[PDB]
Design a protein around this motif. Structure first.
Motif, PDB file in Angstrom:
ATOM      1  N   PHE A  10       0.774  -1.179  -0.165  1.00 21.46           N
ATOM      2  CA  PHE A  10       0.058  -0.049  -0.163  1.00 21.46           C
ATOM      3  C   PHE A  10       0.899   1.196  -0.048  1.00 21.46           C
ATOM      4  CE2 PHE A  10      -4.151  -1.342   0.202  1.00 21.46           C
ATOM      5  CZ  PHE A  10      -4.204  -2.588   1.187  1.00 21.46           C
ATOM      6  N   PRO A  19      -0.667   7.038  -4.280  1.00 20.65           N
ATOM      7  CA  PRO A  19      -2.157   7.031  -3.607  1.00 20.65           C
ATOM      8  C   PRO A  19      -3.084   6.209  -4.669  1.00 20.65           C
ATOM      9  CG  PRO A  19      -1.511   9.173  -4.180  1.00 20.65           C
ATOM     10  CD  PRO A  19      -0.338   8.284  -4.460  1.00 20.65           C
ATOM     11  N   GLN A  21      -3.640   2.945  -5.498  1.00 22.63           N
ATOM     12  CA  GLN A  21      -3.226   1.737  -6.051  1.00 22.63           C
ATOM     13  C   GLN A  21      -2.143   0.804  -5.265  1.00 22.63           C
ATOM     14  OE1 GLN A  21       1.009   2.355  -8.374  1.00 22.63           O
ATOM     15  NE2 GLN A  21      -0.084   4.023  -8.910  1.00 22.63           N
ATOM     16  N   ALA A  22      -1.969  -0.270  -5.524  1.00 16.49           N
ATOM     17  CA  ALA A  22      -1.250  -1.073  -4.631  1.00 16.49           C
ATOM     18  C   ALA A  22      -0.958  -2.438  -5.475  1.00 16.49           C
ATOM     19  CB  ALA A  22      -1.667  -1.349  -3.375  1.00 16.49           C
ATOM     20  N   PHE A  23       0.128  -3.165  -5.014  1.00 15.03           N
ATOM     21  CA  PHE A  23       0.619  -4.259  -5.872  1.00 15.03           C
ATOM     22  C   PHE A  23       0.982  -5.316  -4.485  1.00 15.03           C
ATOM     23  CE2 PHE A  23       4.265  -6.815  -6.738  1.00 15.03           C
ATOM     24  CZ  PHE A  23       3.947  -7.436  -8.028  1.00 15.03           C
TER      25      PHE A  23
END
Lengths: 276, 276
Positions: A10, A19, A21-23
């Motif tokens: 995060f 900010p 989005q996240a993987f």
């Protein structure tokens, strides 16, 4: 930050960032998770990326990708300089930049500033092939206040690399044909920040250029690299000498080479616009 | 596939792929979600990437990134060809490739094969700036069986582009100095698949090269591009004519240009190894 067998990177805005989005990486089992006196340090074996090191919730290295950003961040300044003998790495706890620097025979001594000794140990234990060089006689390790160090070590270094007016410190720490290489954020996310950074270095160094390359586990998938030279005649975008097919294999290079060197500075339009 | 205000692009192995990872976008509100007679079609306004189109759980386009892969996939073959007049787009339901093709004045007629008319409508309603060209008099739209189409349209096309022996069909559909451009997977994930594809096209076309570029919302962050030419003397890696600073701005190019064109073919070592 671990959930349903899944780790999620995060953005820090979780109550310089990415900010919205996240993987995520799939976790087989945790292998370590302590707090040092500096940062939350976590390593886990992942389903498909091997062992991965995350610091303060930010992925740092992966066994699947052990080479791409490290080959670029180290080898850009190294091959651009005509005889780099004395080198400083700021950051580098994981060992990857160090590994790549030691491939240059011209190096006499290489100093590394890492505050968190726990990161080095973790890397030694859980990430080999990233951390072979920690026993090399050319490595001078230092865990001190790195700012004072740089204040007292003027004109020592042919090449400074940093895993990230501090930049004035860096300028003075370099010898006279010194080249600097710094981890350079994302063109997808921090373009106003990159524009800012390039602009102030053009005040400090007579030549400032910004290259970039693909890096899978980095947010949005490309890391940038800031490269500044003290000599106004140094063109850092063409290496000093040019590697042959066999020199490359000799050096176990998986990402980097002379042609790639040069192309990493050919910027996309929207990036070229914002840097003028 | 929507969760806690978060959409997650999982790999299809969920009971050609990217197992062991996933990328996520924060959702403000859903804007559409129906099943056509072909695919689950979903569009939502996201917190930071604007409206995003996902098909069968795979992100297709984003308002934040409307241009990068589109500019490359379309403009590579277009500027490599010396007078492209007749062009075919296979896929393209979102409109992005079409937009970029219409920027080339030489085009007399452009045919597009899209099976799912719902994708076109969605794109018209929720994604402008991606779908302006659907009213252009040069656009010849077709919703038929695309294989039969290609069987009956030999020697018609200067440029075929595909959003993805078969490749024999494509070869015969092209005129004599025809150039082909195909969406080319990820070097991070499908290298044995890329190696395979390049190898069989070297059987079919006298020149086959593989370029790549950064693309943020694509799995692991770089899309590849497969480019094949019928004339053995065509070097697709240098454009026919070379764009000036003003020609670029005239064309509203945000990613692509002649320098970029060329560099997209300079492959990283590990990619260069696997293609020999």
């Amino acid at each position: 930050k671990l959930h349903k067998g899944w780790f999620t990177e995060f953005s820090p805005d979780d109550l310089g960032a990415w900010p919205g989005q996240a993987f995520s990486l799939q976790v087989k089992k945790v292998l370590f998770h302590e707090k040092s006196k500096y940062q939350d340090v976590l390593v886990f074996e992942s389903t498909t990326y091997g062992n991965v090191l995350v610091l303060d919730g930010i992925v740092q290295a992966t066994e699947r990708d052990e080479f791409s950003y490290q080959e670029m961040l180290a080898h850009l300044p190294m091959f651009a300089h005509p005889d780099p003998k004395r080198v400083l790495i700021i950051g580098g706890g994981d060992g990857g930049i160090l590994r790549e620097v030691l491939k240059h025979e011209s190096v006499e001594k290489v100093t590394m500033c890492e505050i968190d000794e726990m990161v080095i140990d973790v890397a030694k234990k859980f990430l080999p092939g990233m951390s072979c060089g920690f026993s090399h006689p050319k490595l001078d390790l230092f865990c001190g206040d790195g700012f004072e160090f740089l204040k007292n070590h003027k004109n020592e270094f042919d090449v400074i690399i940093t895993d990230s007016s501090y930049y004035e410190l860096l300028r003075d720490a370099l010898k006279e044909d010194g080249i600097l290489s710094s981890q350079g954020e994302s063109v997808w996310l921090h373009l106003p920040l990159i524009a800012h950074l390039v602009a102030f270095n053009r005040k400090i160094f007579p030549a400032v250029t910004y290259a970039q390359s693909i890096v899978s586990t980095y947010p949005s998938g490309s890391m940038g690299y800031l490269i500044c030279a003290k000599n106004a005649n140094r063109d850092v975008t063409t290496p000093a000498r040019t590697l042959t097919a066999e020199q490359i294999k000799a050096l176990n290079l998986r990402f980097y080479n002379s042609e790639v060197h040069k192309a990493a500075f050919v910027l996309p339009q929207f990036v070229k616009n914002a840097l003028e």
